[PDB]
């Protein structure tokens, strides 16, 4: 329940998870001109539901509801067994050779993400 | 008549009361908790009590805390307040006796002994003092010179010892902080013998 690094970047593609395993953490990041509230939570922790709640002011779990103000990119911390779906961004053609997901596995104490077998071209 | 308590710097307040059921109740002025202990007889007119605030090495009080300490005795239906004290824990420190005494190195005329301090707050940093004493075969503990360590030092090298001789050794500690802080109890005597 640790999971060291983050999923690989695939050129001209993004990734999302549909269902988040317990132990996943979502950061409480705010948009430009906004900061998380005083005494706010630094993250939300999946336990299943989320144990905290992110909030912003002017300066298995489901995908959490979009709170008032937010950074465009949601920062996650996943855990072993987390699967992550990849897809070529709108306007890009996908070439598949094997799975289009990355899964956090656990070796002899060292976590890793599997390599999504996907190439994206315009 | 008398109600005296000491904080061990971590998670223990030891209380003594001299004036059937009686208890000590502790009310921290700025924490969301309270504790009690059943007073039990020691001397003819002495009762003693330990207030267990948390686990042995946990830091349950601070230098800004004030604990209201009450002695209560049954009296029929309710309780009667027998004594009161506004107890500033860091003004009334008394540590556990040092432990884990051992010989680091014995010669014929020398010995290095080390110890550990028990449940001593990290708040004290190095602001501690020690006193030690040696029991030699000719003499009593009472006759033994006090060895002053005006620093945090967790060993002593005893010099000018006599070969092939049985000694015992003892040590105690005191925080520099606090108006009513007292020496800890002496440690359990460590028996050792110089080389032939």
């Amino acid at each position: 329940e640790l999971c060291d690094d983050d999923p690989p970047e695939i050129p001209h593609a993004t990734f999302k998870a549909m269902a988040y395993k317990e132990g996943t953490m979502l950061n409480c990041e705010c948009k430009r001109g906004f900061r998380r509230i005083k005494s706010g939570s630094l993250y939300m922790l999946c336990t299943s539901s989320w144990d905290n709640q992110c909030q912003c002011t002017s300066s298995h779990c489901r995908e959490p509801p979009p709170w008032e103000n937010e950074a465009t990119e949601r920062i996650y911390h996943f855990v072993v067994g987390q699967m992550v779906y990849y897809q070529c961004v709108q306007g890009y053609r996908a070439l598949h050779r094997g799975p289009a997901e990355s899964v956090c596995k656990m070796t002899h104490g060292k976590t890793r993400w599997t390599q999504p077998q996907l190439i994206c071209t315009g | 008549s008398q109600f005296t308590c000491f904080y061990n710097s971590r998670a223990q307040i030891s209380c003594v009361w001299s004036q059937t059921s009686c208890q000590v109740h502790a009310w921290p002025d700025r924490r969301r908790w309270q504790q009690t202990c059943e007073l039990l007889p020691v001397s003819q007119a002495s009762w003693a009590c330990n207030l267990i605030l948390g686990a042995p090495d946990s830091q349950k009080l601070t230098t800004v805390d004030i604990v209201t300490l009450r002695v209560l005795c049954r009296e029929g239906v309710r309780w009667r307040v027998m004594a009161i004290q506004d107890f500033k824990p860091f003004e009334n420190l008394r540590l556990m006796a040092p432990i884990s005494l051992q010989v680091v190195h014995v010669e014929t005329h020398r010995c290095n002994i080390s110890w550990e301090i028990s449940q001593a707050s990290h708040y004290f940093e190095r602001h501690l003092e020690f006193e030690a004493r040696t029991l030699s075969p000719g003499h009593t503990w009472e006759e033994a010179p006090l060895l002053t360590l005006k620093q945090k030092q967790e060993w002593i090298c005893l010099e000018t010892l006599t070969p092939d001789t049985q000694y015992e050794f003892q040590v105690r500690v005191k925080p520099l902080q606090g108006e009513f802080t007292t020496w800890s109890p002496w440690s359990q005597p460590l028996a050792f013998r110089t080389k032939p």
Partner: protein, 120 residues
């Protein structure tokens, strides 16, 4: 008196230095994930009342702390809370720039050391 304040500040200092030492070292493989969390920083911190800025970050501090699988956050944070409150006695302004815990802890250490050194 000054000596009471100086002692309170040292104790706060030690509590903070305890956290810093406990997290900022090898044998804490949580460190780099802990480094990604944004702490908020005092615009000014030159006097006791500026400790309001510290107080308001104790909650997120405990959360970052709770991520260590080794230190004892609940007591530790409750202790820093009560000392801070005694010391501080306002409306806290924060810097635009956010910090890691390390930068956050070192700022607060600097603050304490800054007052302690004048106190005698």
């Amino acid at each position: 008196s000054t000596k009471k304040t100086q002692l309170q500040l040292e104790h706060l200092l030690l509590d903070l230095q305890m956290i810093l030492n406990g997290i900022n070292n090898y044998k804490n493989p949580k460190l780099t994930r802990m480094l990604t969390f944004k702490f908020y920083m005092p615009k000014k911190a030159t006097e006791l009342k500026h400790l309001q800025c510290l107080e308001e970050e104790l909650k997120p501090l405990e959360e970052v702390l709770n991520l260590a699988q080794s230190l004892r956050p609940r007591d530790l944070i409750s202790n820093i809370n009560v000392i801070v409150l005694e010391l501080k006695g306002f409306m806290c302004e924060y810097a635009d720039e956010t910090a890691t815990i390390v930068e956050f802890l070192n700022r607060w250490i600097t603050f304490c050391q800054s007052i302690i050194s004048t106190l005698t």
